[model samples]
Target chain A: RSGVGSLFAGAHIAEAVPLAPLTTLRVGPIARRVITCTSAEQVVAALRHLDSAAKTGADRPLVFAGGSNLVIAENLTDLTVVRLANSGITIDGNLVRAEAGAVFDDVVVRAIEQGLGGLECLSGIPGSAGATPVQNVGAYGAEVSDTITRVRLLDRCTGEVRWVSARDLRFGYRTSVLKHADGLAVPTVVLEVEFALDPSGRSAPLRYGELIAALNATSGERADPQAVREAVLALRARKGMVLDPTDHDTWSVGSFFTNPVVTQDVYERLAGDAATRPVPHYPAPDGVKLAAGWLVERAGFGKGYPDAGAAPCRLSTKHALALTNRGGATAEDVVTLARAVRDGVHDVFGITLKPEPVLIGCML
Target chain B: FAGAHIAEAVPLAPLTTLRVGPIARRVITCTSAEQVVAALRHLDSAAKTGADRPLVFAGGSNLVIAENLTDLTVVRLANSGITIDGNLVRAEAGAVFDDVVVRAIEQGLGGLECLSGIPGSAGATPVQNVGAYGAEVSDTITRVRLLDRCTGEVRWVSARDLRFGYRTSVLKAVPTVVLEVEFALDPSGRSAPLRYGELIAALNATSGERADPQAVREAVLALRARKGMVLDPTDHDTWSVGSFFTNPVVTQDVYERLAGDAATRKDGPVPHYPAPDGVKLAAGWLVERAGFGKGYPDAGAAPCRLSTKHALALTNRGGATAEDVVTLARAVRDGVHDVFGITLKPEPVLIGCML
Candidate 1:
């Protein structure tokens, strides 16, 4: 449903729009141009138009969805931001398909109400359906990768549109092939996502201990999908992982740093250093995985670090992993705070943690 | 631990939390797996000669029996033993569940602290997937040694094969008996992440924080004690099974219907939690809303009444019979159903009785 139409048909175009209000972190700068597309057809047309414009030495276009996982610079002078706003969800039998712009949690709620399972544990995640495949979004033991059957993509390099199988995405932890970590040479845009779910009204198996305990369920048992969704949402809210506009604790990307996986020798050495206190660790494929938040707390940064209102940006008062924007904070403020915590953790544990979000026009 | 101890005409009331059961014709206490097998074999032979089948009893914290069990033989498990190797804990089925939790904490291990103060034997934990204060035995249970009554076979079963669910397991559905249980705990001495709001406030800790295992255990015990969930001989509030009914899980449509009904009647929001099947409505809340408040039917007037501290428990206020408990439970169950169009199921197993 994306061809045989003009790019700007029924699309809203604006210039010099502020980017901070559009993101959860509420930190980015003004954009040169903003094109809002209400349908996939408009997205395809806009991308084609931008590709042709780039041939004439125009600035490359940036496709933006729910900006939960982005760190943008304050000085984007000549950039054109294309925002996808199409939000539609369709369910057939045990399969669910959602447009790129549909809220991730909305899809989960709809599926559970319709007696479908599999996406319940991922409730309260703030982002778009299309972005889920890009980062392989996960929470409370269940990951989108486990239920994602296919993703519709618009390949920018070849100007081709097709449905790609989930297996081709190469999902690993929070990273996927579609993710632009070090920048993709031939980047692809996600237009929609499809998931295969359980029709028996049973949720995905409960693997997270906190969730199991909340539901009074046994680990690995399939619960009512609605229950799992609520439990996961409550758990996320407790840790300031959910987005709430009025609360500064939620005015930041959820979990700024990924848990660092270190070698056995490195973990053993760290364990020796903290001999008196227990170090929280889990078995990883290649090594031992250390909790990033624990490291941050032990590295001289606690919840509400640097005092409340003492800085423009500070660690969340509810959770140590979140670096919040206290009403007014610049992209640089977030980056600087992230760097300090990262450096401090590295100094104490000899392990470097990686930032989870994409940094545009800035380095961490 | 070497053999079985046999007795005749033993009263079952003193063995159970409810303290209202009939006497058994014969009681056989087995302290070892071999003795359990031998006793069961003997009972099976007697069954062939026209005698009734034996009832296997554990902690008896979650049982309701009839007044005519005198015709039946009772096989009691008394093999209480606890062994901790590193972070792994192995306990005999007859060992008290709280004792295992305390021992694990004493050894500076975590994971079992949040389940403190629950009343049951170690074997019964896996049978019902026992849980409390945001922690379940299923979270750390690695394996179990079970005795198959049908085949007279003894073998170790993985936790996965138990098919655990909310307050239930394959062991509960089948006739197999649990002989031993094993759990993999956290050797770091840090408690499981605090998820329950009440426990978090009690500890004065932030959400998701992990504290010392012993501290968490004490907090959990205190919380349970206040709720009248912990077993205490002197307190009539603890005279009944911890919770008379499992929180009723309903479909979304049913949940909506109940919500609409409550709103139409100007009642506050119904207390509910999302469940695997649908929405889990609080049975205690429903009972209270149905007009069966705590100590309903008046405490001194009735032998059986709802616990004064917790509406969910149907307590035996001394001299209450099995029939009295059943009558009170039925009234509460029926009242809730009549008011909200939802039927609540009892949590404990009933022998020769139905609700």
Candidate 2:
């Protein structure tokens, strides 16, 4: 018993930990055991211990990081949660290497302060740096995949650690190999991430018109890195994308749905269905990408959707894409609202909008 | 010869595509990077240094200057050199961009073929991250040699430092001068994946499939000719800067409003594409729907009229002045805004001018 406990020396262990306080959504059930690892070695040790326990019939461990992108249920009893707490950021020349658990926005701010550009456009995004590659996080015109050079991953199947190039990850619009589809087991866990940056202290070229207008700049012009970060933060805050404990409007995952990329035929049908109004669409590599927020609003789900005081879970008034928890909401309430919005959009346009957050012990 | 060939009171009209700018106080033709540095230093040393900085003119294919450039000095990059080694190609600042594309294709190299027929100097490509037929200069550019005006240091800056975007880059916002550019091409002589629908259809290939680089180049040039985008001095249709206005990218709310307006018209669905920021609406569609048809205001009725081939270009029929072009541009811009509540922004650099 002492030998096994020694492996978790740099970790904090607890039993029957409530999941609500750990997530941005403030919902979810209690886990049987929660292991918070503070270092890469500790994380590996914890995984090893879980492997030993698994042979004796223990449940598979839940690799949890910034809980910003999770939707959990009320019945996760027989589970072990491995919480990543290793936060470290290193800047070597023009390359930024961040450990898995580092707050993503902090990395952006630090890079800007160090006179490094390329990451300013992604400022104010919530979650861990490790989670960024999983979703190929992007905002304005800059995508994390554009700057990422490589990632350090821990292969669960082999229990081996290796460095993988960004190209090998096969990143798409909002996904990479790290993002497992339905019913597939996660094969790898991100340990660290590396990004190549511009040393000229110039922000990424302005691509989004709103951000350009905010900075009083023309499209394609590079601005001061710090100024770009501030402008991005201000824009995200206005849309309730930034986290604020006092503001319930931000008490939820940032964007609840990924904008759906549909076929050209489906897009035409959608345009016909909304004959009176124009469908907001963009060209995707495969076909056409539709704005999910626009579809939701057009399908009769307006901002502050179910109205105040009617239900604890409702769509954010500032942005329709976000589903916020007013207060005291259950995971089921969020799932209910999400399902209704998804089904409503499908019913209207024959296109189903997929949720961006991962669901555990629940389905939308 | 010692400090670049200099002349006094040079007419700028003959040097620009629009043929509408005023005379410059001085013109310096630089044939080498050292001469460029010498001319810049000489200009800085002048006692009567004017209010406006010296304009570094390259191909002069993308500008709209006003008639008040007396305070300006034009530093023309006239050096031309292209060196191809293995799969890499390097071109000096003054090398014609299309010439580089043609040379690359002739040498059995492929990355730049799809960007054929774009009118500009090699140095200006990365400054705007210029794109055509679904291929952007940023896609192939590896690095750029720049003369940092602030510190007077010349170094090969990595492409990452350029921060390229759609039709823009850090060079546009900085004070550096491009000396040369380097591009990496495919040794297999296959063009970059065809992403544009029209290009794919024209080549009779599936989307995302590569084709013979030279073949793609020929098709792109042909398509550009049909649209009057390829330069032809004798053809008035090619007198103006290509695509006077960028496709307007608007918010979801603005897009919906414009969609509602489009529903009122008999025209088909509004043509739009996805932009990094928002939905991108075609400026050509907007201009045509706003009642500015091809060759609007009739030929000879107005000195400047919409291009006879495409509504996007505001062409100079003959002897059109700067004011005439600006007047026509403003009228079309305002008309589109009044109809759809979306303001279109010009894509070219305007010297001493505003709309």
Candidate 3:
């Protein structure tokens, strides 16, 4: 009762603190305490404590599954941020059950190595295994929504972390109910997610032409999971998208904007009366799909452009529409370039391009 | 009341007939050259001196703006419906995209079928070079109808000069708003034969098999629905702005690093199939490894999270503000970058800024 733990009864917090250094971005501020929760129960305890504190008007805590997805402000809030490091993976045929703290790239490689393959194309993406459904992250021709069967979650309202079906998430392009407004929807914490991946370990059918061409395979053929992972990573690194401590370009938040979806008619109207080489219109059950980069470049921006090195936040030297830090840049720099790219593209394409990464304290 | 004037002078939504979004301040539904011409002139006069001259042209859907105080007049294009000349399919700027593709497919055209199920008008297709499946509007597009937003001139441009690429074009410069889109479809029943691997698997076919147009459409619909890429009102998953990010591509320097770093991560070298100048990367993989699992922090939580079913979407489970979605996005981005050292990106159209 006379120990330091007792003196803190007034509101003293204690325990293992961590540097935000260990992330794909290699940046973030320090935190008060980091409880690396290994299982759902530990996660629940953390949640319960956080809830009680909030109720009692005490300092509530911040819950971070895998801090990789967050860009910690240099001066991070001094809060108890629990880091999920739990790792217990069980896979049978196409189904996989993994703890939220599992590494995502590891899961992909594991799926591929185990001879199950729906995740190979998603290779090289950095983060804890727990952060996948937040944005329904997708790449090449595949999106997680297509393969995700059920997701385990901790209902904040009900305060129970359990498995739920894919339908519960309300999947959509880069969005979900969890991130929407509070009045319209509420968010839950994840415990575990069960994926019904393919047992064959053969990558999902390659839908994008570029991916097919890279694999040196036809459109309909499935790729080896491990092989697909390798290919995807190599491609990601070229743009400085795959993080490398030495590569400053990788310091960026990846492609700054999402591609715009427009009606086929509006797409054509911008193209003007041309023959054969019409605008690249990918048919959607809903509308036409266009590349945001192309729109930006067509609107006067070029690859390795904006006058070569003047703007701290520049288009990736390798790719267009990807705003890179290029060493020394701030959130404002990224936003400025994002705005320019968006404004330029919108003026030209008539499609308002949305930024891909979720903003913390700024907007474009 | 000739063409340009007639189209712009009347309620054009009746012409474009889109069902979503809001209404136009002014209606200019054009039928002939004279009407379209007159609408532009009238708009220029009514528009503010510095403001974007009376906002013009909208297709089948109503465009929505979060801001309640937007001052943009609208001009609708009521050109003829679908027009076909030989193997050529031309729609007035106002023609719907799906309808044109359907008509072309019915005529035994193969290329257009691959782009089936896509919404919006034909004119806007080339605006960003709309693409789907393995096919693009550019593949069959032969001509485009445009109006110079600055000078108000109507002109037809050829594909060669349009500067087409993976979902892009010079028309994207916003110089000429699309007035019409002309596609060149294959007269034969041969579809854009077995383009992507997924489509092939969906049909249970081999690499060499040639599937029909209807089959391709069906496969795409099934796949899109599973991902909620297709629009289904009852399904909240489909209540979105659509695919919200594009694949990122990198050049030799970083590409080499990626390839080199590949083998160390677990498997072989990360394959980077080249395209034009740089190589494209996998976004979902980066996010996953960064520690944001599918439906991370659970589905339906604050700051928004992933779509439990799909990994690529940042879904709107039910009710969410743009800010909440942004926070969740940051978490994923930071997480992925921290782990794999790769940054995942978005793929959608933003209204005023990124969400």
| Pairs of residues clashing in candidate 1 | A223-B276, A224-B275, A224-B276, A224-B277, A227-B274, A227-B275
lDDT per residue (tens digit) for residues B168-248 in model 3: 689654556676676655555667767666788888988656778877777887887777666565665544444434455
Residue-level lDDT for B276 in candidate 1? 69
- Model 3 whole-model lDDT (C-alpha atoms): 0.62
> DockQ of each candidate's interface versus the true one?
0.01, 0.03, 0.01
Over all chains combined, what TM-score does candidate 1 have? 0.51
Q: What is the alpha-carbon RMSD of candidate 3 to the true structure?
A: 30.6
Tens-digit lDDT track of model 3 for A44-116:
6665666556553223455565444444444444555656666777875556667778877777777777777
Segments of candidate 2 deviating more than 4 angstroms? A1-364, B1-3, B41-52
Docking class of 3: incorrect
Off by over 4 Å in 1: A1-364, B45-51, B264-266
TM-score of chain B of 1: 0.95
Worst 10 residues of 1 chain A by lDDT: A1-10
Model 1: number of backbone collisions: 6
Worst 10 residues of 3 chain A by lDDT: A1-10
Candidate 1, residues A1-364, lDDT tens digits: the string is 3344544665788999888899999988788899999888788778777776685323777678898887888866677888989789998656688999999889999899988888998988898998898878987887888877567788876666755556557787878988776431227988989787766689988887889999998989999898788788888888888888889999998888988888999888878988966888866688988889899999998998878556999999999988999988888999999999999998977778999888887788
